[PDB]
Write an enzyme that holds these catalytic residues in place. Sequence first.
Site, PDB file in Angstrom:
ATOM      1  N   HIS A   1       9.118  23.874  44.993  1.00 39.20           N
ATOM      2  CA  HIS A   1       7.734  23.841  45.052  1.00 39.20           C
ATOM      3  C   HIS A   1       7.060  22.888  43.997  1.00 39.20           C
ATOM      4  CE1 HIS A   1       3.592  24.455  45.495  1.00 39.20           C
ATOM      5  NE2 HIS A   1       3.458  25.851  45.573  1.00 39.20           N
TER       6      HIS A   1
ATOM      7  N   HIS B   1       0.561  21.622  44.850  1.00 42.00           N
ATOM      8  CA  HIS B   1      -0.633  22.403  44.635  1.00 42.00           C
ATOM      9  C   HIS B   1      -0.925  22.752  43.183  1.00 42.00           C
ATOM     10  CE1 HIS B   1       0.896  23.776  48.958  1.00 42.00           C
ATOM     11  NE2 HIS B   1       0.251  22.526  49.002  1.00 42.00           N
TER      12      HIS B   1
ATOM     13  N   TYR C   1       0.800  23.464  40.726  1.00 43.00           N
ATOM     14  CA  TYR C   1       1.523  24.121  39.922  1.00 43.00           C
ATOM     15  C   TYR C   1       2.606  23.593  38.855  1.00 43.00           C
ATOM     16  CZ  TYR C   1      -0.457  27.616  42.933  1.00 43.00           C
ATOM     17  OH  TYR C   1      -1.325  28.620  43.469  1.00 43.00           O
TER      18      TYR C   1
END
EC number: 1.3.1.42
Lengths: 376, 376
Positions: free
Chosen positions: B176, B179, B181
């Site tokens: 990930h 977004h 993060y």
Amino acid sequence: NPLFSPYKMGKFNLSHRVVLAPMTRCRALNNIPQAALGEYYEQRATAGGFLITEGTMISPTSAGFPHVPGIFTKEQVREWKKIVDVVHAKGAVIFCQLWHVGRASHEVYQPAGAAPISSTEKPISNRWRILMPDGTHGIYPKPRAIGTYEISQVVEDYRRSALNAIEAGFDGIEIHGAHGYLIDQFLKDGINDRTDEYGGSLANRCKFITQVVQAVVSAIGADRVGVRVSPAIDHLDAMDSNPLSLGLAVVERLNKIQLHSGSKLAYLHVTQPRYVAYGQTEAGRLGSEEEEARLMRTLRNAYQGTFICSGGYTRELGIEAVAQGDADLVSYGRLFISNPDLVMRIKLNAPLNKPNRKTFYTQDPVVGYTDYPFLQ
Amino acid sequence: NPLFSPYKMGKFNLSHRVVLAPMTRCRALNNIPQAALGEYYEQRATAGGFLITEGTMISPTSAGFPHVPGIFTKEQVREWKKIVDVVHAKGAVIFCQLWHVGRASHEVYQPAGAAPISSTEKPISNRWRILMPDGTHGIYPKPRAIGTYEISQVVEDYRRSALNAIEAGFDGIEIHGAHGYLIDQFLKDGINDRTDEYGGSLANRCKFITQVVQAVVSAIGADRVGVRVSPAIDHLDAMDSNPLSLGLAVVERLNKIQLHSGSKLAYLHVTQPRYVAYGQTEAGRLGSEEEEARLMRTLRNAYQGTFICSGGYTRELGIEAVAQGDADLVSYGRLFISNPDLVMRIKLNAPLNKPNRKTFYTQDPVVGYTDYPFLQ
Ligand SMILES: Cc1cc2nc3c(=O)[nH]c(=O)nc-3n(C[C@H](O)[C@H](O)[C@H](O)COP(=O)(O)O)c2cc1C
Ligand SMILES: Cc1cc2nc3c(=O)[nH]c(=O)nc-3n(C[C@H](O)[C@H](O)[C@H](O)COP(=O)(O)O)c2cc1C
């Protein structure tokens, strides 16, 4: 049904709370109002109901859509008078919305090939397009940031158009100060990058709408002036760093014009943001709908007068807005397109016709315009 | 239907191109995968279909949502194995997404109430909210900026979690890196204000993601590693001054990892910004997505391997993405929440259930989680 409790708007005894929102429909061929507009507004008029017209041009350079009506020529005034008369024949109240699009224009809507005017030189970004006269979508050009001395001339265009609306017999005008158009291009700090007296602080960015409102108030009286704003909206790159701060600054200056004029405005008309952005992210929607409700109710409590809410309203949401004290009047757009007797249908909780988006902005005087069915 | 053309993703023979996008749902009570997750992923698994799990913690400091699963303990591995087994029994491929939220956390989610970690000491602003354990929305606090040695420890956390995912039977892992993060906090020059070898130039800003990907590639093999980024999404104040340049710089590093490792990653997965065309505005329905599409196509053209697109995709948009060569696979989030049989519904062009946002992140093992109905 709270929507059918009567409401006193100034001198206007309204019999119900369902308002025809202002809607561009592009049937005013070559910018002169047409007989079709008469049948259209006549269909929707009710005894004691309030109508707001489509956005109407204040000058030859102020349009950004095809075949929108003007009210800056004596010919336009003559044709509007016929429309107003049939609405008044049905006992309705009708205001004319005065519309300058600013940077949201195109060479094809600019008679002298001049760049559209605005607060800024920044063009609308590429993800927004304009409707062309042939139905295709066009690119927004670079606008010109107008100098200080040019502000007063545009303010004068509103004043003369407001006087023209009164000459045509309208009960009042609405200032279109919303949705990223000319006035909103000064309001929003995501657009207004000026360094002169109309840019920078919240007070400076509110000067243009204040001067517009004061000019039309000094021309036709506060009671005949309504004002529309949209502090939080996703339209034509109009964003503000603090929508709540911006909304209360506009309300505070409107309240002050009422204090010094000794008369309330007709109303404040605010668009619901209906925030749906970042729905595909993990956190983008957390506490958004709560922030939105707080925005609207804070503005409503602060504004000293009539409050009209608009944007995504249904029969159920309109009832609840009035029931909870969130607004005095609720304007409907898309459902009023497809339901000439939306008022009656809302009273009876009848089925509602579905709108056909394909004919929202077409030029036919009947198809998609006056041939939506009444209750049989 | 091009979405049902088979696709060869490395060794995996996928029978269709509809992918379950990774989605935080908060049913993994106290960070332990639960039986409800097995039922949820089993409902959605199809023969030859590819699934990506919800974001999964790599360490005690990596969470910023309640009840998200981890894969950094052996107890967690044992529970994940049961979920992987029922997904494989239906013939699906499944990757575990490894998620560190960085500064997008709160003292309530950190061991001993410690500050979240990040590239920077700058907090996410108050235009974003965090979901609190009691269902209210809280304020993101000031993070602590980590140094070079601690960066290498976080990298080792990714490596150990990737090994744990393989031990649980996952076909691979997804980084990930999107977004706003932790990885995106190093990528985005709107966040990364470092002056050491992890800040400043494009090369320095890409060091952290390169280190993370290299570490997991060297532990389990490039074929079992996918990477997710979102250069053009500014969720949680994650803006970059030149998103396309940042995106290509990342892609460059991935192509280089592949050449030096001698084999390709499983895929590159990119979420794109998606702007809802508001129907309530004058010009909302005249918008264009061409600029965002050209960004996505340029990243895909630049990357040597399999490309998954995501963000606001529909049946029609997914068909067009594959048909035009703009992506190999299309991942769906919100429609997969509410349609357990989304793959079959898209195949048949059947109606789709609407998702209920109110239960995206609640804790019930059934309500809003496994009780969306199949086609009848
Ligand atoms: C086709 C169309 C044209 C519109 N034209 C205008 C306009 O000229 N001036 C304005 O202030 N708002 C305009 N609006 C916004 C509407 O006045 C109103 O706020 C909106 O339609 C309310 O939301 P609703 O359609 O869900 O009822 C328009 C909306 C539509 C759909
Ligand atoms: C409730 C929800 C949870 C999500 N959780 C994650 C996540 O844990 N990791 C991630 O990379 N993206 C996450 N996303 C983004 C999705 O993976 C995906 O990109 C997005 O939902 C696709 O857009 P769509 O919903 O229109 O299909 C989430 C999205 C939603 C709506």
